[PDB]
Write a protein that binds this ligand. Structure first.
Ligand code: P4P
Ligand code: P4P
Ligand code: MN
Lengths: 130, 130
């Protein structure tokens, strides 16, 4: 609970649209469940991190347009890590992840998965590994 | 062989980048294995169809940048259909697909998958269903 674990998760159907380049930073500033994903880069700066796809999970056939893609989070082995949301935690949690990966010398096979759940906020990043 | 079938396929890791809006049409004109994907819309016109992601499969850890995403084609049930490439076939093959789906009243859960393989060209569209 605030550390990384490794488990065999289920698939999770979800629907997405693109990120337009908006970044995590972009979302923590200005005055106006889902998730989003990004490249598993050896990061340094939220100024550097920039989202790739933004998503919401399904709860529902039919429903969409072509600007959206019905898809899912592959079943598989995910190095995972959970944390109550805060900002000094956000980046500092990503770090533990990338660290753990480089330490275990594991090989990654997907983008990073950011999952926020308004615990009215809970958060988790899972990456897919072998 | 030139008709649709339904089978339980394996996953297929692949790497992608975006389509920029280029469309199938865009690729059949002008003078200068992989695939690409698009929204399972009730189509009419290649003038209307416009690619979403363009991809290549893996044969190879490491390898990329952030403008590319290591990902895959989920294992699952895919209504599939194969055809030697021609142009009058391209759109006319998509049709059989969408038809078959509406006829079987199946429910789709992914974008359409276009797979070209330079048989030096073989081609297939698979969609994921339940
Ligand atoms: C563009 C528009 C909205 C969001 P987001 C979101 C932020 C960070 C990670 C994933 C998603 C959001 C979150 C918190 C406050 C404002 C906006 C967002 C989008 C759709 C549904 C829920 C949340 C993101 C980019
Ligand atoms: C932009 C640049 C290149 C391709 P494509 C391709 C076309 C149609 C469907 C999938 C992929 C290509 C195909 C045939 C002739 C020219 C270009 C392409 C891209 C990368 C690797 C192989 C093929 C597409 C868009
Ligand atoms: Mn995309």
């Amino acid at each position: 609970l605030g550390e990384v674990f490794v488990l065999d998760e289920e698939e999770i159907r979800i629907i997405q649209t693109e990120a337009e380049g908006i970044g995590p930073e972009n979302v923590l500033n200005a005055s106006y469940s889902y998730g989003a994903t990004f490249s598993f880069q050896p990061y340094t700066s939220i100024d550097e991190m920039t989202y790739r796809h933004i998503f919401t999970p399904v709860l529902t056939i039919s429903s969409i347009t072509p600007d959206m893609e019905i898809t899912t989070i592959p079943k598989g082995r995910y190095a995972c890590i959970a944390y109550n949301f805060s900002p000094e935690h956000y980046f500092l949690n990503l770090q533990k992840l990338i660290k753990y990966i480089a330490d275990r010398q594991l090989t990654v096979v997907s983008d990073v998965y950011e999952l926020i759940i308004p615990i009215h906020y809970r958060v988790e990043m899972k990456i897919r590994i072998l």
